[PDB]
């Protein structure tokens, strides 16, 4: 039956069951979008200069 996807999957994916999933596949990039409210931006004088 040949080696399973634990040993043949590209990008070094780890193959797990229940649920059937792949983990730590080093392919692609995740685009992150942050929305920070204006309250979190403090003044320059408060932080060290």
């Amino acid at each position: 039956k040949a080696p399973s996807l634990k040993f043949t999957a590209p990008f070094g994916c780890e193959i797990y069951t229940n649920p059937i999933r792949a983990e730590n596949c080093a392919v692609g990039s995740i685009p992150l979008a942050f929305d920070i409210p204006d309250a979190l931006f403090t003044r320059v004088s408060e932080t060290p200069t």
Binding site: R43, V44, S45, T49
Partner: protein
């Protein structure tokens, strides 16, 4: 007053007092100064320092 230099360590042109100016001074003696800007460029929160 003598040997005074003004530095704008922070400025945002907001409606309120969104700017801080630090002046290095070597005065003859302690006292009270009527700090003022004759021009209309800036409005001072403090009329005396």
């Amino acid at each position: 007053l003598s040997a005074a230099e003004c530095t704008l360590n922070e400025c945002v042109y907001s409606s309120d007092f969104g700017g801080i100016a630090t002046v290095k001074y070597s005065a003859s003696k302690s006292g009270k100064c009527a700090v003022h800007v004759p021009s209309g460029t800036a409005t001072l929160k403090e009329a005396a320092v």
